[PDB]
Amino acid sequence: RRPARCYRYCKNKPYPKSRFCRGVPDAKIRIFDLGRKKAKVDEFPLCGHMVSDEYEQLSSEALEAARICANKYMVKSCGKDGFHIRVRLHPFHVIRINKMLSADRLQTGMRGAFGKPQGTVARVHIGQVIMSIRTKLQNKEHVIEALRRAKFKFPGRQKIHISKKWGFTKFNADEFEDMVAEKRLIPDGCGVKYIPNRGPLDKWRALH
Amino acid sequence: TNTKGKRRGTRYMFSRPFRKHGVVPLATYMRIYKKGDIVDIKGMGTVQKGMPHKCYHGKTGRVYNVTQHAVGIVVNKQVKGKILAKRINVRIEHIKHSKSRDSFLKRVKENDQKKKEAKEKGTWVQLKRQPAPPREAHFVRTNGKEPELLEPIPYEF
Amino acid sequence: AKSKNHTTHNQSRKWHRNGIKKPRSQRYESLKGVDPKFLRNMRFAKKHNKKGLKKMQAN
Amino acid sequence: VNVPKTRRTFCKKCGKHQPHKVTQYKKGKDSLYAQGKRRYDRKQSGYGGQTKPIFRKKAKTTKKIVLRLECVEPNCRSKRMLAIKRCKHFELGGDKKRKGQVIQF
RNA sequence: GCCCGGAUAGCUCAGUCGGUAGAGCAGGGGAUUGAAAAUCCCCGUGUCCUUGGUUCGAUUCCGAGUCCGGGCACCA
RNA sequence: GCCAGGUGGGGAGUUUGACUGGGGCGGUACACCUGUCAAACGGUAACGCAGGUGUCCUAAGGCGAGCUCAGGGAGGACAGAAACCUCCCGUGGAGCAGAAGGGCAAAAGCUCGCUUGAUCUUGAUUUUCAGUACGAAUACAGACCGUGAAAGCGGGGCCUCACGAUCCUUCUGACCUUUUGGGUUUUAAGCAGGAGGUGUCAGAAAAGUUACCACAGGGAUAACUGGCUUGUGGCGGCCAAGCGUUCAUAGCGACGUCGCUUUUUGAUCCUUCGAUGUCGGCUCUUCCUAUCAUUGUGAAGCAGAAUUCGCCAAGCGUUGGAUU
RNA sequence: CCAGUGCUCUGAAUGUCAAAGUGAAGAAAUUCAAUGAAGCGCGGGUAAACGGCGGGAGUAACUAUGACUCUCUUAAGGUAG
RNA sequence: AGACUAAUCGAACCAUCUAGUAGCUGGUUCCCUCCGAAGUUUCCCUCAGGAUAGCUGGCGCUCUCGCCCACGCAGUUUUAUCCGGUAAAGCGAAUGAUUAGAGGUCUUGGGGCCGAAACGAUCUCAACCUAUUCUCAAACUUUAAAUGGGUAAGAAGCCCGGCUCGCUGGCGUGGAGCCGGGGUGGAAUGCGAGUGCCUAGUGGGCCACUUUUGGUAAGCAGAACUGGCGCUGCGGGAUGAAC
RNA sequence: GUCUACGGCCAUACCACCCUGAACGCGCCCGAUCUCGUCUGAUCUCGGAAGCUAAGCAGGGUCGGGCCUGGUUAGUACUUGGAUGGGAGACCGCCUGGGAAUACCGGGUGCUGUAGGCU
Ligand SMILES: [Mg+2]
Ligand SMILES: [Mg+2]
Ligand SMILES: [Mg+2]
Ligand SMILES: [Mg+2]
Ligand SMILES: [Mg+2]
Ligand SMILES: [Mg+2]
Ligand SMILES: [Mg+2]
Ligand SMILES: [Mg+2]
Ligand SMILES: [Mg+2]
Ligand SMILES: [Mg+2]
Ligand SMILES: [Mg+2]
Ligand SMILES: [Mg+2]
Ligand SMILES: [Mg+2]
Ligand SMILES: [Mg+2]
Ligand SMILES: [Mg+2]
Ligand SMILES: [Mg+2]
Ligand SMILES: [Mg+2]
Ligand SMILES: [Mg+2]
Ligand SMILES: [Mg+2]
Ligand SMILES: [Mg+2]
Ligand SMILES: [Mg+2]
Ligand SMILES: [Mg+2]
Ligand SMILES: [Mg+2]
Ligand SMILES: [Mg+2]
Ligand SMILES: [Mg+2]
Ligand SMILES: [Mg+2]
Ligand SMILES: [Mg+2]
Ligand SMILES: [Mg+2]
Ligand SMILES: [Mg+2]
Ligand SMILES: [Mg+2]
Ligand SMILES: [Mg+2]
Ligand SMILES: [Mg+2]
Ligand SMILES: [Mg+2]
Ligand SMILES: [Mg+2]
Ligand SMILES: [Mg+2]
Ligand SMILES: [Mg+2]
Ligand SMILES: [Mg+2]
Ligand SMILES: [Mg+2]
Ligand SMILES: [Mg+2]
Ligand SMILES: [Mg+2]
Ligand SMILES: [Mg+2]
Ligand SMILES: [Mg+2]
Ligand SMILES: [Mg+2]
Ligand SMILES: [Mg+2]
Ligand SMILES: [Mg+2]
Ligand SMILES: [Mg+2]
Ligand SMILES: [Mg+2]
Ligand SMILES: [Mg+2]
Ligand SMILES: [Mg+2]
Ligand SMILES: [Mg+2]
Ligand SMILES: [Zn+2]
């Protein structure tokens, strides 16, 4: 388990877990949502997420220790059942270790220099979401103090932008309540099905 | 070491594009190929007899030979030091006309007719193409209304 | 005995020393590689240009 | 492969398709007093040992099954040869197959 | 760390021949013996190591690993 | 005495492949295909990655005509996770011998019906290319045909690989040429096209050790130093779940992450092969501080005692022996 | 320990085996056959000749270790020491 | 002990053959003027070398510009016109990975109770389907740029007329070929072009902006495009092969 | 205005579900002695008109799905050329030109050639 300082800058083309690689073990993370998974749309209006700043990799284990510490502060300070935290960065990018000292010089040099796989990492662009947390409107200082305990644990440097949208639906939070009740939008669990007015007319008759 | 063979880089070049897998549309065969024509070469994955080669895809050559259901071309292919005149034998489906000469032969027909009229009335014609000159001293209008003022946007993320 | 294998570094500069000479213009294109039945018509067509016509065409 | 005993193929005397018998090509016994056999034996008789290189490094396992064709139709009888591609096993005239048939081992 | 070999019954072996599951041993119910050992009649059982392609069919032919046991880790 | 056949490292003459992050052991990247890398023409390397091949086919070749595939649903004696029939939906999710890539629907697939175009011959061109060859392929052209009502379609396998010079041998071909003073015949020599091989695959006939070694040389090529790099080793830093009777942080610290160092090592081959004398100890000198003790301080879960945690800090110290 | 590789003994009992020699055909060169010395092949002997000498499993009233029982297997399975 | 055999031994000494061979080291003697590169392709028992192209030099030859438009050419644009599948983008478009909920109820795997007690039925846990949803692909793509690659920009063209043909054929038709006649002016820009012989040297390369594969990384290993060091001084970077 | 036979462009012309369809015509249909073919006249072939547009087909409709076409998305994403421009690096800004793609929104929904038939 090598230091993550070296596998940090994006250098190689993506080499994902698929039909031809096959040897890489499981990711460090398995799950992505931690608070009230079952939440309605109207319960958690605001959202606060972590804007990436660099063009780097994140190690897969950096995701795991971050959502632990982000979960641990929410359950202390907004309690249980009062948030919803989604990791929006799946690690597919598989890296390689060229294991040596196998300690003697009487085996092989840099000859067969392709790597057998070791673990997955995750890529990052500039201006890309890592963890979104949608909360009650009162948790606004807490969402800052939750993610600041995660920002000390990712590599590099990237900031926290409490967004402008309603929760995890893509629509503007200023227009969401104005418009869900009147017509068109119909709430669906965590997300919201947007409806058009280009469908068959029994879509419209099924409403009202 | 690149496995120096025939038709090796052609996952995408002899691939028929999309939604047009099917028969060759039979106006592909009923085009009239006289000698001396200038025709272009596009490979077809569908007719596996007479596809040219991968290094002649898209090049423009000249018809020299015509047979029952193929056509010989003379083609200016490039090698290491110099550029060669080669003879390819391509079936008809991997041929189409080049509209470069069609717009050229319409450029001839206009220039003949202007030459007819220049003798007719005695006006000098200038059918020779000059390149696009710099613009003329035009005279814009701003009737009554003021120009819209533009200043840059603020930054909000 | 390890070496370098293949590079076209400095091959652009060698080819264009004398220049890419384009053959492009010549007249009466060479007449090999022609469809032979066509040529088994045309050589006959030439030998009766001489014999077949004096008086018809010249007059 | 299986190629049938009889086969109707172009004969080169009387300019036609005629039937032929596919008979197997054999090497035939070589000749003493042939040209290279005499030259190799004049070269051999001496205190010099082996002079022309014999070949020890065999790599191919297959011979091209080549075919005598005798014209069955009489008075022409012009034997000629042909080749099939390389192959490991070859039977001439038996057991052509069935499609609609169970194997039953 | 590379190069080579194998998984079948409760153990040890077959047959690996792509159409039967076999051989011995122990266990089980008989008979012989007043009672056992041994002898005689008998039967009982295989996630054919795991997983998938090959075939009509896999226990066989290939690929992949879970491991066991080899042969090598040499010149300074 | 001479001829023949055995034995014959006793004696003689030669050979010990090449590529290679030194060699060697390994492996074939040594011929040839497929996808990628390749930076939207073509070309383009590594012991770069994934894979294949030295075969198989009288039909899987040829032509016509018929039909349409995998998969799912609803149904129907024993019948069920699977038999058979029937209907519906079914754009390729099946099939086309095997590596993949393309291509394919009254078809290149399935079944059937006649079949040998897998035959005879002279060029031209495409491919690899030095614009030479083998191999392979495309258009033709002269024949003899197959199939089909016919236009047509076919000179092997839908395409991209599936193979091989001279010299020698062997065989076939003309009612053929030369067999040496002229003839007759046998044998031989030729002309033309098919085979028998060179897989190190544009084609040598081939084992081992040298520490008893020898010469030509190389820092184009190792083992020692020095340099670049710092995985690994070593040292620290940030965040705080915990531990610490209570107490996140006096003393520690999981999960994570950022650095330094050249005393281990590894990796690289730049310097040295007309040599830089390459382990350890002994003797002696200086320096570094990342401080073991000392001088002066700070902090504790510091009462004193002993300890431990940091600070300015190299001035001075860091021994005596048994084993190797 | 005679499997191996060696040496050696004996046999027309029997597969191979070159010249010469003989028979048949051919105008002759040549072509073919029959016959078959040593050696090889086949049978025996020898290890104070080169040399070679196993691995599993279950098992005793504390548990342990295993005389014992089993199985694959070799030319033979390291006895004395 | 591979010892000793005239200071010579894992084959003495002496003279000849012998000036043996070497793809391997070292040297290769006067000036000036002009021109001035390569480390690449293919094949070779090829890998420290050659062969061949490429690159270089020399010697010529055949021509044209010296006077409302020239001839020809090109690492260039312009105007037309086809070709590509990389960036980017997309996956609620295929193929392939993939997270989370809500609705819908044929389907069995499990329970809570009616219990002789029954598919006579109550709430189900899971899967299924539909519509969303998070995130990705060198060996996936509908879409699809920049840079790019080919050709075209007239007298070799264009038109009219007439003969030949043994090929084609309802057709005096198809198409080539030949003969005669009629009008030069068909984008910008720059230039003098065309062509043959012989042949040395070379066939160990290296660095830099961007693009890149193997590596943790390298004053590392392998490439593409262009320039340079080499082959080259001078002014700047204190000094230095490349800035 | 339409339709058949042969067709070129190959979904603006398919798909689902539905409404209308005068006259020719396209069809279904009644039938198997010949011609021809299957287990069966269902398919194929063969000879005719007792019936009908219910089906094919043709037209139109669906706040239709697809398809085609144009906006928004966006001068963004990337990008040739340039710099003693920034930054330790990651990568970024600028000058110089070229410049997309989807969610999302609006609009289309066969056009025809040759012969021949119907009002
Ligand atoms: Mg080289
Ligand atoms: Mg002799
Ligand atoms: Mg094994
Ligand atoms: Mg066992
Ligand atoms: Mg010897
Ligand atoms: Mg070597
Ligand atoms: Mg390319
Ligand atoms: Mg390119
Ligand atoms: Mg498929
Ligand atoms: Mg497949
Ligand atoms: Mg068919
Ligand atoms: Mg012919
Ligand atoms: Mg004579
Ligand atoms: Mg070779
Ligand atoms: Mg030797
Ligand atoms: Mg050097
Ligand atoms: Mg470390
Ligand atoms: Mg070194
Ligand atoms: Mg060096
Ligand atoms: Mg180097
Ligand atoms: Mg013996
Ligand atoms: Mg005799
Ligand atoms: Mg015990
Ligand atoms: Mg003992
Ligand atoms: Mg000795
Ligand atoms: Mg001496
Ligand atoms: Mg010696
Ligand atoms: Mg000399
Ligand atoms: Mg002399
Ligand atoms: Mg000498
Ligand atoms: Mg000069
Ligand atoms: Mg070389
Ligand atoms: Mg040298
Ligand atoms: Mg010159
Ligand atoms: Mg590509
Ligand atoms: Mg991309
Ligand atoms: Mg040269
Ligand atoms: Mg390098
Ligand atoms: Mg030099
Ligand atoms: Mg220069
Ligand atoms: Mg310079
Ligand atoms: Mg200077
Ligand atoms: Mg400086
Ligand atoms: Mg300097
Ligand atoms: Mg009927
Ligand atoms: Mg009947
Ligand atoms: Mg109707
Ligand atoms: Mg009705
Ligand atoms: Mg309508
Ligand atoms: Mg629509
Ligand atoms: Zn004959």
DSSP A65-83: HHHHHHHHHHHHHT-TTSE
Q: Which two tokens stand for residue C37?
A: 């039945």
Chain E footprint positions (protein CB, under 7 Å)? 1, 19, 56, 73-76
Q: Tokens 């992505």 belong to which residue?
A: A32
In the complex, which nucleotide's C1' lies nearest to the CA atom of residue A8?
I90
Q: Tokens 């890529």 belong to which residue?
A: A123
Calpha distance B118→B137 (Å, rounded)? 30
Distance of C37 CA from I85 C1′ (whole Å): 72
Q: Which two tokens stand for residue B125?
A: 């014609």
Cβ of residue D55 lies below 7 Å from strand G: no
How many angstroms is the resolution? 3.9
Q: Which two tokens stand for residue B79?
A: 């090698």
Distances (CA, A) of B45 to B28, B42, B92, D81: 14, 10, 13, 38
Query: C21–B82: do the CB atoms touch at under 8 Å?
Result: yes
Please give the span between the terminal C-alpha atoms of chain B, in angstroms, as a whole number.
51
SS3 D70: strand
**Residue B40, beta-bridge partner list:** B60, B96
Buried b (16+ CB within 10 A) or exposed e, A78-93: beeebbbbbbebebbb
In chain B, which among 49-88 make CB contacts under 8 A with chain C? Answer: 64-67, 72, 74, 76, 78, 80-85, 87
Backbone φ and ψ for B81, nearest 5 degrees, come out as -95, -35
SS3 B8: coil
Q: Which two tokens stand for residue B34?
A: 């006289």
Calpha distance A191→A132 (Å, rounded)? 14
Calpha distance A189→A42 (Å, rounded)? 10
Cα–chain-centroid distance for residue A14?
A: 18
A79 near A60, Cβ under 8 Å?
no
Residues 6+ apart with CB under 8 A from B40: B58, B59, B60, B95, B96, B97, B98
Chains D and C touch (3+ CB pairs under 8 A): no
D80 near D12, Cβ under 8 Å?
yes
Calpha distance A72→A74 (Å, rounded)? 6
What's at A165, amino acid-wise? K
A42 DSSP assignment: T
Q: Which two tokens stand for residue A116?
A: 């057998």
What's at B73, amino acid-wise? I
E-strand ranges in A60-124 read 83-87, 93-97, 116-123
Calpha distance C24→B84 (Å, rounded)? 10
SS3 B121: helix
B55 near B97, Cβ under 8 Å?
no
SS3 B40: strand
B41 near B52, Cβ under 8 Å?
yes
A47 DSSP assignment: E
SS3 B111: helix
A145 near A155, Cβ under 8 Å?
no
Please give the span between the terminal C-alpha atoms of chain D, in angstroms, as a whole number.
21
What's at B43, amino acid-wise? G
A44 near A143, Cβ under 8 Å?
no
A81 near A35, Cβ under 8 Å?
yes
D52 near D40, Cβ under 8 Å?
yes
CA angle D77, D79, D81 (to 5 degrees): 155
**Residue D87, beta-bridge partner list:** D63
Count of CB atoms within 10 A of residue C39's CB?
Answer: 12
Distances (CA, A) of D83 to B102, D27, D58, D66, D78: 53, 14, 22, 4, 17
Q: Tokens 């009923």 belong to which residue?
A: B30
Count of CB atoms within 10 A of residue D23's CB?
Answer: 13
B33 near B63, Cβ under 8 Å?
yes
**Residue B87, beta-bridge partner list:** B74
Residues 6+ apart with CB under 8 A from A120: A17, A24, A27, A28, A60, A91, A92, A93, A94, A95
Calpha distance A21→A34 (Å, rounded)? 31
